[PDB]
Design a protein around this ligand. Structure first.
Ligand SMILES: *[C@@H]1O[C@H](CO)[C@@H](O)[C@H](O)[C@H]1NC(C)=O
Ligand SMILES: *[C@@H]1O[C@H](CO)[C@@H](O)[C@H](O)[C@H]1NC(C)=O
Lengths: 49, 49
């Protein structure tokens, strides 16, 4: 029936994110603060735009 | 500290009602402070929040 097994693994570390909570309290967006230049701007303004 | 359900019963008080509209001292399951309560219809609490 053309099925596949998949198990994707990545390592964890202690780091700072910026999270966006909507009206219902659900996390909708995140940015890792040390991954790019735009992410540095987004974390220094605490804004996704 | 000051949050949870592992409580010390050295000073024991009876449970009171959550009175709304007036300035009160509060001790809500460890959380202490002063303020004014207002009853609301909230739908953003899950079973673990
Ligand atoms: C599974 O993939 C093969 C490709 O060779 C195809 O011929 C077959 O019809 C597929 N079966 C199902 C159930 O999708
Ligand atoms: C102010 O006093 C009135 C009683 O005269 C009381 O009903 C009201 O709740 C009080 N307001 C506050 C904020 O405590």
């Amino acid at each position: 029936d053309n099925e596949t097994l998949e198990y994707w693994v990545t390592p964890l570390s202690r780091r700072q994110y910026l999270l966006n909570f909507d009206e219902h309290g659900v996390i909708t967006n995140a940015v890792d603060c040390s991954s790019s230049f735009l992410s540095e701007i987004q974390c220094k303004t605490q804004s996704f735009a | 500290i000051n949050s949870g359900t592992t409580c010390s019963n050295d000073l024991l008080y009876s449970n009171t009602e959550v009175s709304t509209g007036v300035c009160v001292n509060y001790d809500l399951y460890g959380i202490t402070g002063q303020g004014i309560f207002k009853e609301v219809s909230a739908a953003y609490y899950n079973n673990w929040q």
